[PDB]
């Protein structure tokens, strides 16, 4: 099962305040109109270069996530668990069961804060760059049953954890949607309050590239040069002389 | 007490603290103290997002290789700095600790490698090096070498062959909240007047006023189209201030 995430998964790329400006940035974003996998439940999934996660389930249904590699007692794993009053984030040599784990040896990181989680759609973005596990989130009202919501809403930084571990796989702790981030170029529109209200995926289509080339979200009638095409080399060919005698360097060195 | 071999160099991450660099620079104990991308006399005025401290042992003649743009066995196969490196290299003679009679063979370095290391890359494998065209299959012999070698430090060695302990401090300066700052004391905030300012490492001149800009909790400053900061969050009061030129 797949859904179309129309323009979802946009987050504030940095901590710089901007307003009344169109800003072009390079980062890991969910491509517009990509195919997002719709899960019903609970398999272990690849983390790849970052994960877009969304759900309409209650906070007492989706408890949190496990991120790591082997997801067993052999390596450090990141455990994010919510409850009625708080959120607990730990990195340990966890041995997971099947209330989440039976053991947690060699704990290196602990963080405690407030809970992370017509219905209400919850969106999260998980990145792991240079040892920092970055989480972005947004909570909005939803009136849909079978698909993702339309319209634009940017996700704000929630927490930035100096965990220092590698993540290749993850699992959700218990329906939800999972997409993956890619290195794209986006044009982000900041309003007078510094809120991102729109965005253009510059690789979505010829119209979007025109918009990105122009630093404008509207295009007037006309013809515009947006890029160059160029054919890439299919292969490399080496053509040297077919002599075989070796240069007498050894004779110089061992005189 | 114990330093790493250069091929297996140690790294420590330093954050969320006050860094006084003058105690190191003004010391009489270090034979080498060389900074790149920054002057040592200004370190106490600066703020960084992170600091890394790398440490290892090499012989005296090799200290020159611990610099940007260097070549040789250490720069090539053991510990490589970037060309745009920002940080300081500190070294001192450790003959009194690391040498012994008959030779200390604990300290080792990589002698052979298929290719040069990338900056800040670490390689601790001990696989057999293939010098010839014929595969070694993990066996040492003709054209098949063990990649590592020892210094064998002895107290009677010439200075170029004596052990030196090296610490490399690399300064990470990203567009992010600085967590490591020098010991500069803060003053009271002055508004509606032309002043010089220094906000968590950000220096400039202008008039400061209360701002109506609605920063989100993560946001620390704003910028204009000229890449100039036009608003800051005060690191102590968390108040948002506008910056305009005098």
């Amino acid at each position, epitope marked *: 099962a797949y859904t179309n995430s129309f323009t979802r998964g946009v987050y504030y790329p940095d901590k710089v305040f901007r307003s009344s400006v169109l800003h072009s940035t390079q980062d890991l974003f969910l491509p517009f109109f990509s*195919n997002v*996998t719709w899960f019903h439940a609970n*398999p*272990v*999934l*690849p*983390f*790849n*270069d970052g994960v877009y996660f969304a759900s309409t389930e209650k906070s007492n249904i989706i408890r949190g996530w496990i991120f790591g*590699t*082997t*997801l*067993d007692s*052999k*390596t450090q794993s990141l455990l994010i668990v919510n409850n009625a009053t708080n959120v607990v984030i730990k990195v340990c040599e966890f041995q997971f069961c099947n209330r989440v784990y039976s053991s947690a040896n060699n704990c290196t990181f602990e963080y405690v804060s407030q809970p992370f989680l017509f219905k209400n759609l919850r969106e999260f973005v998980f990145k792991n760059i240079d040892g920092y596990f970055k989480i972005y989130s947004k909570h909005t009202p939803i009136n849909l049953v079978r698909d993702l919501p339309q319209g634009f809403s940017a996700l704000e930084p929630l927490v930035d954890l100096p965990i220092g571990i*590698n993540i*290749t*796989r993850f699992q959700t702790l218990l329906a939800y949607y*999972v997409g*993956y981030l*890619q*290195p794209r170029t986006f044009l982000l529109k900041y309003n007078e309050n510094g809120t991102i209200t729109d965005a253009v995926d510059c690789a979505l289509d010829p119209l979007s590239e025109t918009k990105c080339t122009l630093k404008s979200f509207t295009v007037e009638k006309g013809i515009y040069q947006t890029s160059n095409f160029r054919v890439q080399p299919t*292969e490399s060919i080496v053509r040297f002389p077919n002599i075989t005698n070796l240069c007498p360097f050894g004779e110089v060195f061992n005189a | 007490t114990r330093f790493a071999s250069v091929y297996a160099w140690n790294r420590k991450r330093i954050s969320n603290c006050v860094a006084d660099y003058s105690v190191l620079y003004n010391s009489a104990s270090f034979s080498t103290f060389k900074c790149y991308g920054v002057s040592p006399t200004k370190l106490n005025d600066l703020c960084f997002t992170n600091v890394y401290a790398d440490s290892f042992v090499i012989r005296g003649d090799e200290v020159r290789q611990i610099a940007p743009g260097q070549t040789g066995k250490i720069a090539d196969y053991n510990y490589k700095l970037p060309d745009d490196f920002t940080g300081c290299v500190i070294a001192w003679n450790s003959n009194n600790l690391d040498s012994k009679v008959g030779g200390n063979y604990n300290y080792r370095y990589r002698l052979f490698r298929k290719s040069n290391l990338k900056p800040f890359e670490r390689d601790i*494998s*001990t*696989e*057999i090096y293939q010098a010839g065209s014929t595969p070694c*299959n*993990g066996v040492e012999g003709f054209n098949c070498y063990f990649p590592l070698q020892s210094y064998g430090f002895q107290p009677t060695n010439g200075v170029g062959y004596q052990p030196y302990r090296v610490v490399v401090l690399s300064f990470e300066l990203l567009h992010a909240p600085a967590t490591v700052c020098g010991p500069k004391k803060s003053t009271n905030l002055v508004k509606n007047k032309c002043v010089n300012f220094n906000f968590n490492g950000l220096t400039g001149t202008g008039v400061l006023t209360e701002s109506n800009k609605k920063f989100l909790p993560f946001q620390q400053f704003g910028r204009d189209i000229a890449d100039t900061t036009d608003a800051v969050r005060d690191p102590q009061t968390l108040e948002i201030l506008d910056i305009t030129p005098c």
Partner: antibody
Amino acid sequence: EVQLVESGGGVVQPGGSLRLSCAASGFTFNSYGMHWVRQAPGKGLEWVAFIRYDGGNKYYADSVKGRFTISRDNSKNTLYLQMKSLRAEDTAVYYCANLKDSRYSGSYYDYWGQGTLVTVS
Amino acid sequence: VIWMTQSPSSLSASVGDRVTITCQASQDIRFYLNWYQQKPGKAPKLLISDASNMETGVPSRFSGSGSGTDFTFTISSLQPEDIATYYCQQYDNLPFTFGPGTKVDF
């Protein structure tokens, strides 16, 4: 039901070229990295190549590096292997697979196709 | 490149016998080893991952352990259906490598 179906095998001459493809279904193809593995007649398994989930980063065995190219089309759920300058030594049954790997691909499941025979003669 | 070795290259065993297969890496690969079972004409099946973690659906008679360079695969009580060639595979670093393969027969 998860399936991986190799096709495009056959018989070619030395120095020639052959392109293999693997049709994937039953799983989220565009979320996993993919491998090619080959097995010569009477021989054990040999790893050939690996491609990441976005098709961005590619890795090859030293024995095929510079001759084989790996690619994927995530809109067709199809993995490809382009083999040039084929040698007699390249005769083998080629498999596409999703190998369980906690360090690189992040796959927690192990999938294999039936394999397709490529003969160089 | 990490060189993988297995021993014995071939062993004979009866039903009910304990079968042990050794796999050795030329480099320390921690616990990043897979074990596969292949029967003639079929693709390899994964039995063990992360050195000692059993796959779902794999009979309890199969086990494995080890760390660093020396790993062992064991069948506590060989059954008629366990006649196959076993391979070890490292995924500590690329390129990935398989061992020679150990053939078990009657």
